[PDB]
Design a protein around this ligand. Structure first.
Ligand code: CDL
Ligand code: BCL
Ligand code: BCL
Ligand code: BPB
Ligand code: BPB
Ligand code: SPO
Ligand code: SPO
Ligand code: SPO
Ligand code: SPO
Ligand code: SPO
Ligand code: SPO
Ligand code: FE2
Lengths: 305, 281, 50, 39, 53, 54, 42, 54, 43, 54, 43, 54, 43, 54, 43
């Protein structure tokens, strides 16, 4: 009857400081508090966190980005805490107006402060990518996380930097707001015909649904075979046990083919990087090559015409 | 035919309906009672799709569409060429899905594993049934369901969304999208981490789960663990699908207006309703 | 038999509904009831009695 | 099953005593209300 | 007519907590129903009696 | 109340006292909010009206 | 006893709890008397 | 007072003092915000009206 | 009793100092209420 | 009175100091923002109006 | 007793310096409020 | 006063100095931004108006 | 008592240097405010 | 100046130098962007205006 | 101290080099500001 969804007994010992492969231990912190809720679901220990030079860079730039957007929101609220709470999710930093193009001459109230915040955010995100690469390297691991993050960065860069330059205007970029960037996506789909008829939109949606499908499948399988110690997959790769065998046989008797304890993770990483990569391509194509996706679909056998 | 380790697991037991009857394999597949049922329903649905394509007059697989009955039929039968085929295909699709889930249960109990996978699949079946059965039945007609076509069910999505203005102002929609995005992020991170531990720098030994724990503790200051990450993936996927089903079931049944107008209850709270500043003032 | 956690969750749900209606009447808005009831219900359910 | 028969007897007796006290207060309250405004 | 065996079957703490919550919630809902009705709203009829409004 | 301390040997006093304090505060806040809702007993509006504070 | 707390401890705890409840009720009674003098609700 | 000193046999002083501080501050803020929300007793606006600040 | 570990004398002394603090806080609140009631009474 | 120092045997001084500093700064900022948002006591605007800066 | 752990003579000196800091902070606050009230009273 | 130096036997000077630097920079940036957003005290626009730069 | 591992002498010298830095910073800020107030008083 | 050199007995110079470099570069870029954002002080646009580039 | 391990002499020499760098950077900054102010004053 136990479904292994929540832990039923929770044990604590000395905190684990981690490995020392070639990490600079002076740049680590201490262990944080233990948390019983996280212990119910997963691990209870918090920390230690590594903070080196790239971490200082990322923290400074991201803090400045968050602070710039927040101070703009406070200016819009009239420095009123009540108005700030009420109209939160309604404030936004807008990019420059279309008349200014790509120029950096737009005023602070119009689009200059958006440019400042965007510079801060660009630096923060690229330094965080460098941090993921260097943290993988210090421990001697492969850089799979860095390249998957690079896929995500590719979509972010297309949305905020690459497509506005190809279109020749900063006004093409995304505002910094909660409802405002949602309105931005709706207007983007409306201006460019119907984004449903962008085929790379369709591929991106296929791979998003595929991520949900695959990782429900995989989480359920690991939970189902965890009675045999299936969740310790790194040693099921080195020493195949009955858990991996039973998982493979379930999926082979069900859908005709199966995976390994490592090939399934290759499937996983590719299924997610593909959603973000195809999305980047589809957004870059919108407006620069196709200005009306429904008409493109009519010309390409996708709409009745 | 068999995997190098498959032979010892193929034993006579664990069926739900029938006994030694239907207790055999066809190639790699296991075909029980519900295997036969699944095959029948799926083949019938696929042939009926092809026959609907014949009726419609198109052979382009991207233009084939099977439409539900018009609103004038309500929740009753329709002529085959004018909505009856859609109803038959819906019954076949439901039967195929439910028989697939029951076949998976039979495989689970033949292999001695838990039934997490059929439960997770049942969540998706319930989302499909929400879109095709529960919401049309509450709304009063089969024509509120979506058509069976590659690019026309996207037309259904577009029209249904734009009936209520901009659709990602629906709150449960916001929750479902957040869960979907978080799930894709978690899947990418998990696959990358496992691969990087199993495939280190060239000439290195394999890493251990301690190295993975250390990698994410160095990166973000917290590691959820292996059991934790698999529980998280299952729950993120299921919560995404559950909240999508909810946001659709409340859409044409309780709500009827633009959702951006729903968000005005927060703005019109009595203690800041009339303060003159900001966006809504 | 039912677990102590399960009993806490049943009684937390009924307390949530009760206090929610209670403070949605007391306050002018249903959001006040939702906030107060959800806070009380979370506190009640997070502390099993065994 | 954690209680014995004696313990159950005593618990039930005290609980009924309290319940009858509560009912008595409810009776006098209902009578006061009915005198104040009959229904 | 024994009726004391309910303390056998169920844990007394669960019984006490459940019945206390139920009784308080029931009394509160009865009071809210009385306040909602134009009659028996003792605050409003007190205002009308003494010309508060 | 011939012998009511039996509830004290059944219930842990810390939990009972926490629940009682939370419950009493909530009940007082509720009655106050109800009185503030009704214009007849909103003592702030009563004071504003009888002192011509508009 | 589920708590294991003995009879004499229960009696003493109940006595002090009753004294506190009486003090609380006395304060509430005088508050109601003052408010009734100010604005009767009957 | 009479016998209340024994509450500390039951409740840990750290928990009680932290909860008490949070409760007192939130109560004070709530009463202040209620007074600010009424057009009367809003000491900022009534001083502006008294000295003709607008 | 053994819930917290404070003995009888410790609990008594702790309550004494706690009551001192409570009365000081109450006296400040009473003076504040008197000032506000003089300035703008609510009764 | 004269024995409040014992509070430091109950509370860790550094945790209290951090919480106190954060609390005081947040309170001060909140009050300053409340005074800025009011048309009265907005010192920048009233200084601009007095000296004809606009 | 010292749950965090400080001798009574450590606690007394920590409280003495804390009172010094509190009184300095509050005196600066009194002067600021006096200046603001003279410039622009709120009563 | 004379006895404040004992704050350093409680707080680590390194952590305090880093938090203090971040706090001071963010406070200064916020005040400069507040002045810039104000029509008056926007020194750039004031100099633009005085010297007829536009 | 010395939670950081600093003695009385180390703390006194640290505080002396920190006071010197604080007074230098405050003098610069005071001069900046004096210049701005002469240029554009806010009262 | 007087005794500030003891700062290097408290802080690791590597961390200080990296933090200074990051802070100084980000601050300089922010100020330059603010200057480009003002219609005055945008050296490119005002050179264009004074030489009739556009 | 034991925080970083530099001795008094190492720290003094490090601070001398750091201050030379700071004064060079500030001199360049002052020259740039003087040039800009002659070209376009902001007061
Ligand atoms: C004719 C047209 C069709 C073209 C193709 C047709 C040809 C036939 C089919 C070919 C398909 C083959 C697919 C098989 C690949 C699988 C290989 C693999 O997974 O393992 C092997 C190998 C490592 O295996 P391993 O056993 O795990 O190694 C362990 C190591 O010991 C230790 O680990 P490590 O340190 O060595 O590194 C581990 C990592 C390492 O693999 C890598 O190093 C990948 C390098 C990053 C990707 C390169 C783009 C970056 C930009 C260039 C700048 C850097 C270049 C230099 C890279 C440094 C390499 C030294 O391995 C991984 O598994 C990572 C998987 C996730 C990678 C996702 C990368 C997405 C980045 C998004 C970029 C977006 C910008 C442009 C988008 C497109 C523009 C329109 O990984 C790879 O080789 C990855 C290949 C990267 C593919 C890039 C994507 C192509 C996108 C094109 C989309 C279609 C175009 C349509 C649009 C057209 C517009 C006009
Ligand atoms: C979920 C909420 C909406 C909806 C919204 C969208 C949107 C929006 C998009 C799709 C897209 C797709 N949808 Mg749809 N879709 C719905 C219901 C369905 C159902 C169903 C029986 O419930 C099915 C089978 C499909 C099928 C499909 C595919 C044609 C395509 C990629 C999905 C995918 O890979 O998923 C992940 C699953 C896998 C990776 C596993 C493999 C599944 C294969 C690819 C399915 C092929 C089915 C075949 C065409 C028909 C049956 C024979 N949709 C409902 C009405 N769907 C995208 C597209 O490109 O459309 C043209 C797209 O843009
Ligand atoms: C009316 C609205 C339009 C429409 C307009 C758009 C537009 C416009 C876009 C999409 C995009 C996408 N849409 Mg669409 N979309 C519609 C209908 C749908 C439907 C549906 C059932 O109807 C579905 C399922 C989807 C699904 C999808 C996704 C597959 C895809 C986004 C991938 C992603 O993860 O982005 C979210 C992820 C990112 C943006 C990457 C972020 C990475 C960076 C590095 C993160 C930085 C974080 C920052 C530092 C955070 C600080 C955080 C703190 C540390 C906590 N759309 C309709 C037709 N959609 C995108 C796309 O690629 O399309 C091709 C896109 O741009
Ligand atoms: C495959 C495609 C998926 C994917 C991929 C990956 N995404 C990654 C990685 C991979 C592989 C990482 O390795 C990396 C990371 O470390 O993970 C833990 C990262 C991250 N993805 C974040 C956000 C995010 N991903 C989204 C989507 C998807 N991502 C899609 C679905 C979405 C949305 C909108 O859906 C959001 C908002 C941050 C949490 C984090 C960068 C933090 C940063 O840049 O900080 C730098 C910025 C700051 C520190 C600012 C802080 C501001 C104040 C302090 C607050
Ligand atoms: C809830 C969390 C996720 C979730 C979960 C899980 N999902 C599972 C499992 C789990 C756990 C399984 O165990 C099971 C399986 O074995 O996986 C390999 C399954 C499966 N998920 C499929 C598709 C899928 N999952 C989607 C979504 C999610 N899944 C969500 C996000 C989506 C979309 C749109 O997003 C799609 C398309 C099939 C591949 C497969 C069923 C095969 C079947 O039933 O075969 C039997 C039926 C057939 C072979 C064809 C029958 C054809 C009918 C008659 C005609 C139909 C025409 C159609 C209406 C036209 C449309 C245009
Ligand atoms: C819409 O409906 C409206 C709101 C209009 C009306 C509806 C109304 C209702 C439903 C009202 C319900 C009112 C009730 C149910 C009130 C009950 C109030 C109670 C239960 C009060 C008890 C107060 C008791 C108090 C403060 C006890 C204080 C005890 C204090 C110290 C004693 C602590 C115990 C100790 C010290 C002993 C120490 C330990 C040992 C071991 C000796
Ligand atoms: C919306 O509501 C509005 C805004 C309208 C008004 C509502 C308002 C409220 C609710 C306001 C709250 C006001 C309060 C309650 C303020 C708190 C004021 C206090 C109590 C401030 C504490 C001041 C104490 C200060 C700065 C301490 C200075 C202390 C020191 C330096 C301590 C030194 C300690 C040391 C050095 C180490 C020595 C170690 C040894 C061993 C000797
Ligand atoms: C919206 O609200 C507005 C913005 C309108 C107004 C609200 C305003 C507020 C709330 C303003 C708050 C202002 C505050 C709270 C200011 C505190 C400013 C401080 C505390 C400044 C400290 C200056 C101290 C400075 C730079 C440090 C000088 C320190 C030194 C050089 C460090 C040397 C110490 C040493 C080296 C180590 C010695 C080593 C040995 C071995 C002896
Ligand atoms: C909206 O806000 C606006 C932008 C309008 C205004 C806001 C403004 C603010 C808040 C501006 C604050 C600016 C600040 C805080 C500037 C601080 C500037 C400093 C303090 C710069 C220090 C520069 C020091 C520099 C270049 C020196 C680096 C020194 C070196 C390389 C020298 C080498 C030292 C060595 C090598 C050790 C080797 C010796 C041995 C024995 C190993
Ligand atoms: C009291 O609260 C305080 C004030 C303390 C802080 C609270 C703050 C708030 C309320 C912060 C609001 C944060 C929000 C609401 C952020 C919205 C973030 C979103 C949702 C962004 C959504 C899409 C953004 C996208 C794609 C950005 C893409 C950006 C880029 C690639 C960066 C492009 C970099 C470049 C443009 C400009 C190039 C110029 C130079 C000099 C390199
Ligand atoms: C409109 O009306 C609304 C709707 C807003 C709500 C209406 C009404 C209500 C429900 C108001 C609530 C009023 C209440 C219930 C207030 C509670 C006030 C209390 C309980 C105040 C306690 C003040 C006590 C204070 C400051 C004591 C602090 C004590 C200390 C310094 C002394 C501690 C020092 C010590 C302990 C060392 C201990 C000794 C050793 C040996 C360790
Ligand atoms: Fe896994």
């Amino acid at each position: 009857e136990y479904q292994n969804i929540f832990s039923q007994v929770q044990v604590r010992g000395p905190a684990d400081l981690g490995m020392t492969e070639d990490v600079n231990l002076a740049n680590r912190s201490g262990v944080g508090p233990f948390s019983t809720l996280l212990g119910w679901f997963g691990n209870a220990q918090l920390g230690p966190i590594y903070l080196g030079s790239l971490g200082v860079l990322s923290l400074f730039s991201g803090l400045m980005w968050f602070f710039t957007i927040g101070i703009w929101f406070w200016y819009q609220a009239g420095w009123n805490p009540a108005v700030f709470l009420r109209d939160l999710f309604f404030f936004s930093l807008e990019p420059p107006a279309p008349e200014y193009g790509l120029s950096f001459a737009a005023p602070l109230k119009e689009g200059g402060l958006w440019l400042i915040a965007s510079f801060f955010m660009f630096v923060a995100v690229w330094s965080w990518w460098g941090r993921t690469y260097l943290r993988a390297q210090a421990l001697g691991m492969g850089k799979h996380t860095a390249w998957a993050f690079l896929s995500a960065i590719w979509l972010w860069m297309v949305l905020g930097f690459i497509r506005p330059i190809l279109m020749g205007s900063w006004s093409e970029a995304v505002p910094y707001g909660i409802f405002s960037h949602l309105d931005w996506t709706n207007n983007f789909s409306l201006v460019h015909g119907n984004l449903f008829y962008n085929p790379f939109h369709g591929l991106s949606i296929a791979f998003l649904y595929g991520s949900a499908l695959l990782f429900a499948m995989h989480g359920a399988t690991i939970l189902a075979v965890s009675r045999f110690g299936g969740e310790r997959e790194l040693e099921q790769i080195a020493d195949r046990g009955t858990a991996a065998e039973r998982a493979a046989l379930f999926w082979r008797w069900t859908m005709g083919f199966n995976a390994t304890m490592e090939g399934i993770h290759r499937w996983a990483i590719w299924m997610a990087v593909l959603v973000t990569l195809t999305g980047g391509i589809g957004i870059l194509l919108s407006g620069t090559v196709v200005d009306n996706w429904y008409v493109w679909g009519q010309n390409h056998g996708m709409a009745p015409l | 035919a068999l995997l190098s380790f498959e032979r010892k697991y193929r034993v006579p037991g664990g069926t739900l309906v029938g006994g030694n009857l239907f207790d055999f394999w066809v190639g790699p597949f296991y075909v029980g009672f519900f295997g036969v049922a699944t095959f029948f329903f799926a083949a019938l649905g696929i042939i009926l799709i092809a026959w609907s394509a014949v009726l419609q007059g198109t052979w382009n697989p991207q233009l084939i569409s099977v439409y539900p009955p018009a609103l004038e039929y309500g929740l009753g039968g329709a002529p085959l060429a004018k909505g009856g085929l859609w109803q038959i295909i819906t019954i076949c699709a439901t039967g195929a899905f439910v028989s697939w889930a029951l076949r998976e249960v039979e495989i689970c109990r033949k292999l001695g594993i838990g039934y997490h996978i059929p439960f997770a699949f049942a969540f998706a079946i319930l989302a499909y049934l929400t879109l095709v059965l529960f919401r049309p039945v509450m709304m009063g007609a089969w024509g509120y369901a979506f058509p069976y076509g590659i690019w026309t069910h996207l037309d259904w999505v577009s029209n249904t969304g734009y009936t209520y203005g901009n659709f990602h102002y629906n709150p449960a929609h916001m929750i479902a999208i957040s869960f979907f995005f978080t799930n894709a992020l978690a899947l990418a991170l998990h696959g990358a981490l496992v691969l990087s531990a199993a495939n280190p720098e060239k000439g290195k030994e394999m890493r251990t789960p301690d190295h993975e724990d250390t990698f994410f503790r160095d990166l973000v200051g917290y590691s959820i663990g292996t059991l934790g990450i698999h529980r998280l993936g299952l729950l993120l996927s299921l919560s995404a699908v559950f909240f999508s089903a909810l946001c659709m079931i409340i859409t044409g049944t309780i709500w009827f207006d633009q959702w951006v107008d729903w968000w005005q209850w927060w703005v019109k709270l009595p203690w800041w309703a009339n303060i003159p500043g900001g966006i809504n003032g | 038999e039912v677990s102590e956690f399960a009993f806490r969750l049943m009684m937390a749900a009924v307390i949530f509904v009760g206090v929610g209606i209670m403070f949605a009447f007391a306050g002018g808005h249903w959001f006040v009831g939702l906030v107060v009831g959800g806070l009380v219900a979370a506190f009640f359910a997070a502390t099993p009695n065994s | 099953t954690g209680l014995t028969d004696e313990q159950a007897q005593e618990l039930h007796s005290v609980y009924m005593s309290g319940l009858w006290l509560f009912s008595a207060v409810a009776i006098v309250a209902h009578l006061a209300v009915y005198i104040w405004r009959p229904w | 007519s024994k009726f004391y065996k309910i303390w056998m079957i169920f844990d007394p703490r669960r019984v006490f907590v459940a019945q206390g919550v139920f009784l308080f919630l029931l009394a509160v809902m009865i009071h809210l129903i009385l306040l909602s009705t134009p009659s028996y709203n003792w605050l409003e009829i007190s205002a009308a009696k003494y010309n508060r409004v």
